[PDB]
Amino acid sequence: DIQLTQSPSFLSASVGDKVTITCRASQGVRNELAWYQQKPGKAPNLLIYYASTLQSGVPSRFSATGSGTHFTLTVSSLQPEDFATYFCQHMSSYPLTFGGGTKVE
Amino acid sequence: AVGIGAVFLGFLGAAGSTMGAASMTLTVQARNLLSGIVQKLTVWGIKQLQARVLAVERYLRDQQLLGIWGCSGKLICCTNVPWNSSWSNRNLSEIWDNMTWLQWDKEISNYTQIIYGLLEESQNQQEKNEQDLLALD
Amino acid sequence: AVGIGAVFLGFLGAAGSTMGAASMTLTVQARNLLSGIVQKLTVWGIKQLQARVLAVERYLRDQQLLGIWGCSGKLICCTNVPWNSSWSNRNLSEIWDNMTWLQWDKEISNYTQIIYGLLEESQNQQEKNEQDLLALD
Amino acid sequence: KKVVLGKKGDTVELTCTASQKKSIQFHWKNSNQIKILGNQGSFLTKGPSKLNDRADSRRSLWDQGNFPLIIKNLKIEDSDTYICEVEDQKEEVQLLV
Amino acid sequence: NLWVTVYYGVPVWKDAETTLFCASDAKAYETEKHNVWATHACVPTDPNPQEIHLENVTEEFNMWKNNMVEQMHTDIISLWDQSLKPCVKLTPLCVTRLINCNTSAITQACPKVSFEPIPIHYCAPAGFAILKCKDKKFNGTGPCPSVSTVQCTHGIKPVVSTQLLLNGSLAEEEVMIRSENITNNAKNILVQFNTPVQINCTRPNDIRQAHCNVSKATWNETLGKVVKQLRKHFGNNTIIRFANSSGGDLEVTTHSFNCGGEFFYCNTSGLFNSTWISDSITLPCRIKQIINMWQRIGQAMYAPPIQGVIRCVSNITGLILTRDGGSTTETFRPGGGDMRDNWRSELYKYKVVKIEPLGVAPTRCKR
Amino acid sequence: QEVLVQSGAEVKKPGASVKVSCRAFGYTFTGNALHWVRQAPGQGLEWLGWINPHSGDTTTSQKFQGRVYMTRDKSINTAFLDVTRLTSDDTGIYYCARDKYYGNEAVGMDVWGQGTSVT
Ligand SMILES: *[C@@H]1O[C@H](CO)[C@@H](O[C@@H]2O[C@H](CO)[C@@H](O[C@@H]3O[C@H](CO[C@H]4O[C@H](CO[C@H]5O[C@H](CO)[C@@H](O)[C@H](O)[C@@H]5O)[C@@H](O)[C@H](O[C@H]5O[C@H](CO)[C@@H](O)[C@H](O)[C@@H]5O)[C@@H]4O)[C@@H](O)[C@H](O[C@H]4O[C@H](CO)[C@@H](O)[C@H](O)[C@@H]4O)[C@@H]3O)[C@H](O)[C@H]2NC(C)=O)[C@H](O)[C@H]1NC(C)=O
């Protein structure tokens, strides 16, 4: 299959910081990755589709860049509601696999 | 990405979609324009069947226009009429990729009959009356 | 002499003009054949929609009969059936420049079904099923 | 500017006509825009003005496009510029006692 | 270089003024006197209404220039002229400032007929659609972004009433205030409720003495939400006063409604009395027989009521409020009487559009 | 408004079958493809399969091929997931997710249900 590695596995930061989280794909996937946020006990909600475009309803402080196998999610200023688990998942080829998950605290 | 095939959005759907995407699914809409199927004194069909006849008549009226700007291989054909500058002079990158059909007909509704009369008369009296001269030899 | 352009005779106005002059004004008669639009005892809701149903059933049958003798780019079309010379033998200057349509029907009305059988059969079993041999390669 | 004069203690008449012969929405207010009386289709409503016990309108002329105003027992303090809103028209009429 | 091409079947609609039919769900066997008319003009409904939902369209809805409330006003007049036939009617004629008016006396047979409302739909013929606004915080006019195309609507119960909205449609999120123009002082402010205010209203075993109980705490918290919503449009510092009425006819100075064919006129003086700044109420109803008509100008007197206790519980779902603009605090007294405004509260989010599936666009084709 | 509603939690013995239903509200069910995703307790997200509600066509991962089956019903706008031959590894939360589906291909999963806990 295609394996997604997310770095770092656990990140620690304060309120108001700028953070960057890297998704690395084992194969060439073009720009077909999506970025999701999950609170414990609740369903994940989408932030980024097409690896650069913002979902409607998501605030503008989030961004995502990258190409090929190298992919970054960037939060410009951390808010207390933004402290959750972040995922990357692709759709270039079957089967679909999700990332390992990045918990921020 | 991966795919499974196209979908069915419904009657009058994709009105907010782009021009080239909404022009793909005219068959589903045109089939629903005719609808059909359906299957004391107690005569309410005097209203109800009335409505059915009206719907059929409406189709023939539209068919009459599409029968007389003569293609009859419907949902797409072409004519030989060039455009005029007073009828929403826009370029292709304005007109085909970035607006819906609602915003197109919202500005072409001023110029309905002035193009419909020209399409009525010009090719239908000019593509005619010349193949008879071509049938002389 | 001096001219300004064509005029408007109206509904059934070509019964007194020549057939060659009547050929340009077929379309304005063909538009309002079905007319359209229109918009406890039961009148105007029964015994009047029967008139609309009869008009629609006449118009669809005439349009189907025109579509069988396959032209479908209607109001003028040609056919590869030869004309029999025994059926009111006249010259082209006599018919198309000096005669009306009604007097022509007055002479040709004895041969209507003999026209309709040949037009109904001969082309559409001879124009078709030779393209079946033409599209072999 | 129509001006209507009235006597003290009598009944004074104030007319307000429509463009056509149809009963439409109409309102009678004063210069400080407190309502005297308006309509609600087939019904009549009195406003919060001080003429509430003495203002009246005739119901049968409403089909003729006439929306009158009857003020019985006229006092000197009732002399004011009265506005009738009829069909987005502001017919302003001056009343003297 | 580019040639015009025609297209048949493009999703294009225009604003029309067509005539719809009803198609309600009747039983065609009862004598409820709604179901006689509800079969007389209505075909039975469909079991599967379609709910096709659009994606990117934004459409301008309008409330007070809508062309569905006149279609309401025609057939509800046609229904009330057959269902409840009164005994004696007095309608002035006034055949043509030099005019005199005479009144007639039309007398017909007046049996005692059952009367309970039946929810009805309004459905369109082929070639039309009804756009419906799905915004939970709709102002009333202007744009709606979540426009959905609908064959036909939900059940509207035609309850003739004044001063309130009885058995209406509940709001989605919060209390809504809908007005054509605030600070105009001449148009009825329609207010919808987000919760049903339950009320019992009965005549028990003098026959013209009916008592009408409404809960105190639920009404108090409902008008707490209401006076919370009126402070949004008025500077968040004004005092709000609710008066009872200001003169007028008995059908507008009192809460006038119907119950089993009985014509109820309940006083609401103790129901609107509080002043707001920064267990059960009984209503003294009087059953009358000589009433005024809303369909036309005139009088109508009816048969004496039947014997026995009469029961009708109902859900209060809205308000017709009217400002008293003076020269500070704000006075808001209840009003109504205009039935076009009575059924504008349930037809506020619908629009009838006519389809025109014949367009033209430039492309690069030939022959 | 656009929401997916799932069924309640279900506890089953190994070797049995489990059926979970997902109903759509607020959008046209025949126009968007539907994904199924499972999360193990304390673990990440595992994708399962995805279905067209219109044609009834399915696409299933090869690891669970022939064991999980996905069906639809357009009359009540509900999709059904059947997971047969249960082990203790299949315990987790099952989620139905609406594909955004731009350009007739997979884009992203934006509308997610409340979940079904299967033990
Ligand atoms: C309701 O409204 C919404 C909102 O308006 C609407 O949503 C939009 O729908 C359109 C559908 O056409 C979407 O457009 C699609 O976008 C696809 C993704 O493209 C991205 O990537 C492009 C580059 O990728 C190429 O290159 C990289 C290397 O760099 C490579 O790895 C990739 O594999 C790939 O080869 C990029 O160009 C693109 O756009 C950026 O750049 C353009 C440059 O002009 C700029 O204008 C943009 O602003 C942006 O910066 C984007 O980043 C795309 O693949 C897809 O293309 C297909 O269709 C087009 C049809 O024109 C064909 O020409 C093409 O060959 C493909 O077949 C398509 O263009 C759009 O993203 C949606 N969102 C928004 C916000 O607009 C809904 O559709 C409406 N309707 C409904 C029913 O909901």
| CB atoms F52 and B5 under 8 Å | yes
Q: Which CATH topology does D1-97 take?
A: Immunoglobulin-like (2.60.40)
* Contact criterion met (CB below 8 Å) for E193 and E347: no
Which element (helix H / strand E) includes D29?
A: strand D26-29
Of E161, E68, E69, E176, residue with least CA distance to E117: E161
SS3 at position E109: coil
How far, in Å, are E10, E14, F1 from residue F28 at the CA level? 19, 23, 12
| CB atoms A45 and F113 under 8 Å | no
Query: Is chain B touching chain D, with at least 3 CB–CB pairs below 8 Å?
Result: no
What is the CATH superfamily name and number for domain A1-105?
A: Immunoglobulins (2.60.40.10)
- Pick the residue from chain A with its C-alpha nearest to B1: A92
Which element (helix H / strand E) includes E199?
A: strand E189-203
Q: Is the CB of B20 under 6 A from ligand 1?
A: no
Does B4 reside within a domain?
no
Q: Is the CB of B3 under 6 A from ligand 1?
A: no
* Contact criterion met (CB below 8 Å) for D26 and D67: yes
Does B5 reside within a domain?
no
Check residue A33 and report its DSSP letter.
Answer: E
Name the residue ranges covered by the structural domains of chain A. 1-105
Rounded to the nearest angstrom, the minimum Cα separation between C72 and chain B is 8
Query: Is chain B touching chain F, with at least 3 CB–CB pairs below 8 Å?
Result: yes
SS3 at position F10: strand
Length reported for chain D: 97
Query: What residues are paired with A71 via a beta bridge?
Result: A23, A66
Query: SS3 breakdown of chain C: % helix, strand, coil, rounded to 5?
Result: 55, 0, 45
CATH 2.60.40.10 fits F1-119, yes or no: yes
Question: Among E4, E43, E52, whose Cβ lies nearest the Cβ of B81?
Answer: E4
Total domains present in chain B: 1
Q: Is the CB of E56 under 6 A from ligand 1?
A: yes
For B87, the token pair is 């009828």
SS3 at position B69: coil
Burial class (CB in 10 A: 0-12, 13-18, 19+), E78: middle
Q: Is the CB of F28 under 6 A from ligand 1?
A: no
SS3 at position E265: strand
Cα(E246)–Cα(E184) distance, integer angstroms: 19
| CB atoms E53 and F28 under 8 Å | yes
Does B3 reside within a domain?
no
For C6, the token pair is 């064509």
By what method was this entry solved? cryo-EM
Helix B26-34 with B45-68: angle, nearest 10 deg: 140
Q: Could you tell me if residue B72 is left (phi over 0), alpha (psi between -120 and 50 degrees) or otherwise beta?
A: left
- Chain B residues touching residue E358 (CB < 8 angstroms): 62, 65-66
Tell me the one-letter amino acid at C101. W
- Pick the residue from chain B with its C-alpha nearest to C73: B70
Cα(F77)–Cα(F68) distance, integer angstroms: 20
User: Rounded to 10 degrees, what is the CA torsion of C79, C83, C88, C94?
Assistant: 70
Handedness of CA D37, D40, D41, D46 (dihedral sign): negative
Cα(B91)–Cα(F19) distance, integer angstroms: 55
| Residue A35 CA to ligand 1 centre (angstroms) | 17
**CA angle, residues B65, B70, B74, in degrees to nearest 5:** 75
Evaluate the omega torsion of the peptide bond into residue C82 and state whether it is cis, within 30 degrees of 0. Answer: no
Query: What residues are paired with E288 via a beta bridge?
Result: none
Range of the domain at C112: 12-134
* Contact criterion met (CB below 8 Å) for E209 and E265: no
Q: Is the CB of A31 under 6 A from ligand 1?
A: yes
Of all protein residues, the one whose alpha carbon is nearest to atom 7 of ligand 1 is F102
* Contact criterion met (CB below 8 Å) for C66 and B67: no
* Contact criterion met (CB below 8 Å) for E6 and B77: yes
Q: Is B23's Cβ below 8 Å from some Cβ in E?
A: yes
Of all protein residues, the one whose alpha carbon is nearest to atom 29 of ligand 1 is A67
Check residue E156 and report its DSSP letter.
Answer: B
Evaluate the omega torsion of the peptide bond into residue A95 and state whether it is cis, within 30 degrees of 0. Answer: yes
SS3 at position E61: strand
* Contact criterion met (CB below 8 Å) for A32 and A88: no
Q: Is the CB of F31 under 6 A from ligand 1?
A: no
Of A105, A102, A91, residue with least CA distance to A1: A91
* Contact criterion met (CB below 8 Å) for A64 and A73: yes
C78-91 in b/e form (b: 16+ CB < 10 A) is eeeeeeeeeeeeee
Cα(F105)–Cα(B23) distance, integer angstroms: 19
Name, in order, each residue with C-beta under 8 angstroms of A74's C-beta and a sequence gap of 6 or more. Answer: A18, A19, A20, A21, A62, A63, A64, A65
**Tokens 């064509």 belong to which residue?**
C6
Phi, psi (degrees; rounded to nearest 5) at E333: -110, 145
Q: Could you tell me if residue A96 is left (phi over 0), alpha (psi between -120 and 50 degrees) or otherwise beta?
A: beta
| CB atoms E52 and F1 under 8 Å | no
Name, in order, each residue with C-beta under 8 angstroms of F88's C-beta and a sequence gap of 6 or more. Answer: F14
Name the residue ranges covered by the structural domains of chain D. 1-97
